[PDB]
Each structure stands twice: as structure tokens, then as C-alpha cells.
Amino acid sequence: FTLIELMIVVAIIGILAAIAIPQYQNYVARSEGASALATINPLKTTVEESLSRGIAGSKIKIGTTASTATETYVGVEPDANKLGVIAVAIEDSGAGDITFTFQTGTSSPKNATKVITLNRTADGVWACKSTQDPMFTPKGCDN
Amino acid sequence: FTLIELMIVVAIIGILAAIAIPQYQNYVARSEGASALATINPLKTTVEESLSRGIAGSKIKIGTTASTATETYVGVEPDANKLGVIAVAIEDSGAGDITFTFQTGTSSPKNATKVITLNRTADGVWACKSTQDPMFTPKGCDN
Amino acid sequence: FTLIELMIVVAIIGILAAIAIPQYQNYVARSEGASALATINPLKTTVEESLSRGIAGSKIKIGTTASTATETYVGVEPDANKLGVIAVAIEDSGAGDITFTFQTGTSSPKNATKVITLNRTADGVWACKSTQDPMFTPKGCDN
């Protein structure tokens, strides 16, 4: 062994120890929101079916407790998605809101304690809102 | 040659022979599970299609033996993924379970002999479970 | 200067001239295959899109000659990767094969003149094969 090889190796080590690293948080922050809505959107179909068939609101709940000719139970647990929690509460007058609240022990720091919501007016119009940042909100709701 | 250069080279060799090395097993242990579910999830689409079209269960199998107007064969071999083996067995009553068992001759030591499963209730609800550690289980199932 | 220092230096030189060197060929032989498949896998998406949209096979080629409403040209040159050459030839009946042939003037000696292939059956099943050694074949194909 000589000093030339060792010095060249030391120099190449320092050269390699210079690669830059860009940001990688917005990607996950957007992927979380792209999944939350994709998971909590289909419930509108069951809500509309239950409201148009004949049964009134309130009885519409979540979980996995079978179904009957009076109450409706969509086949998803309130904590099926480990990213957050889902909550539904349809009033007797048809108006209601299905909300998804991000959990702090699973979701990302930016999307922590944030809430998305889909509301149904009394006449029968579906709107949606969220509390996340503008760049992280999906391309289907406001803020 | 002198003793100064040789001693400096020997000292620099010992200095370089001190770089620490962190852990690198959890990465592969999690990547294996992230691929297992991603590979064995899409079969639910074919299962639901076969159960809703008209054909009964049981006949639903795996492999590559073409298809007809009675039996269904999803286009994947039982050992397509070298990490483990897939097994499906839908009962005549619709209830069934698609399982993925990790092999010992390919999978990692931690994820060896572990089994993931996706079950379909009689009424028509999809659940999933696994036997891996909590930190290695994907963010879509329990333990 | 004395003889003690010179003899000690000569002895330390011989001592240092005894470091062993392990093998380092399998690493590159496996890295080449890990890159070949990673580069030539995504073409299946474009193949399936072109076969399901409406246009027939044959017209599907490679290079960079723009696109139109009849022919498809995936944005990669036949020699984009300097490790080998890519070749696609989809038949009119949908069946085809995308192959990657390693070049002798760039690839390693072990992975020289070897060929990987991804075939599409007539019914619509994707299989893959290779001609490399068992230990160098990726964990997604046979031999």
C-alpha cells in the first residue's frame, strides 16, 4: 500500500459524499389525501340508495353488523383505513355529512388533525370541503 | 520510503476502519409485505365478478388453463411470485379466503412461514388479517 | 539512518501487503439484471393500452417518431440503455414478445449474449423467461 491510493480513495469518498437530496414530503401529503377521498366517496351511493328506497335517516350507520329491511350498515369499519377515522350521521330530514378525520398516530405531520367532509343539503345537493392546505387538497373540493 | 509516510498511512487506515453501519433488515421486511399485498389484492375483483355473474364458487381456481363459460381461471400461477405461494378456495356459499404463505427458501427470515389472508363473509364483507409483526404489517390490515 | 528503522519499514510493508480481496463479480452480474427488467418492464402498460384501445398489433414499434391516431411509438430508443438492445414485435393476433438482448461491448462477461423475454399469450396472459444463470436471474422469472 502507498499514500497515492489512500489519498485518491479519501478524495473519491468526499466527492461521492456530495449528492443532493430534494424534498419528499409533499408527495406523501398528497397521496394521503388522494386515498382518503377515494376511500370515503363511495358511501354517497349507499346514502342515496337508503334515502330514496324508503327508510329514514339516523338508522344509517357504519360497521359490520349485517343488514335487514329497516336499518342499513355499509360494509366498512369506522377505522378500516389506518390513516384516519370515518363518521356518518344522517339527520331525519335527509340532510347529513360524512366526515373523515385524520389521526395523529398514523397520518403525516402536515395532514394531522385535518378533516374532510361531504355534506348533503336538504333539497338534495352534494358538496364537499376540507381543512388541508391548498396544494394538498384534491382536485374536487375547496378549502 | 520513510517511517513517517508508512505510519501516517497505517493511522489513516485505522481511521477509515471506523465507519458505523446501521440496521437494514426492517427495510426488506417491510418491502416484502408491501409487495405481497400489492400482488394478491387484485384477485378480489375477479372473485366478485365470478360471484356476481352467475357461476358458483369452488370452480374458481388459479393457474393458466384458459377460460370458458362455466369455470374461471385468473391468469396467475400459484407460484408466480417467488416470495411465497398463493391459495384460493371459494366455498359454494360464496364465503372464502385468499391466502398468501411466505416461503422459507426465498422470503426473509423474519417474514418466514408467515401468512396473510383476505376473507369474504357470507353476507358479502371483505376483511383481511396477517400473522407478521406489528411494525411489518401493511397499513391496511390488523394482526 | 540506521538498519533497524529500514528493516522495520520493510517488515511493515510486507505485513500490509497481505490484505485479502473477496469476489466482486456477482454483484455487477446481478445489478445488470436488476436494471434490465426494471427498464424493459413498463412497456407492458403501453402494449396493453394499444391492444385494448382499438388499434391492432404490428404497428406498435419503438423509437421517437411522435404518435398519431393509428400507430403507437413508445418514447424509448432501441438502444436507450447502453447495456443491451430492446426489441418488440406484436403480432396481429395480439400475441407477442418484448425481448432484451445483452450486448458484448458493454455488458459484463457473464451476462454477455444473454436474452430476457416477456411473452403475451393469445388469450391474454403475461409470462417471462430468461437465459441467465439461476443465481443471476431476478426474483420474478424462471430460467
Place this chain on the structure above:
Amino acid sequence: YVGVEPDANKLGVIAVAIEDSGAGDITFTFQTGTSSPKNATKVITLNRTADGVWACKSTQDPMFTPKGCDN
């Protein structure tokens, strides 16, 4: 099979024995017929825990132990 003989280095002998559970230890034992008197019959070792942590130890004197292990 790593491409090195168990006695490639004439200063000592190498020994590896990885258990089925992943835990193992790679050791280097200095020989008396080649190594120096001070570094005679001494053993260096690199151990791998079950979870996956690499540690190293030696039995040489403090001043002779390299700057990457304990004693």
C-alpha cells in the same frame, strides 16, 4: 462461498459460523507461528445480533486495539 481461504492472511485464521436465526460471529484468531509476540493468541470478533445490529470486540491491549472497537 466468499472468495477467501480460511488462511489467506498468513497473520492468522478466519472463522465464520452464521446460525439459522441470522445471528452469528466472524472471528479472526492470530497465529503464534506468524503474528508478533504481543498479538499472539489474540482474537478479534464481529457479532451480529438477532434483530440486526453489528458489534465488534477484541482481546488485544487498549493501545493496540483499532479505533473502531472496544476491549
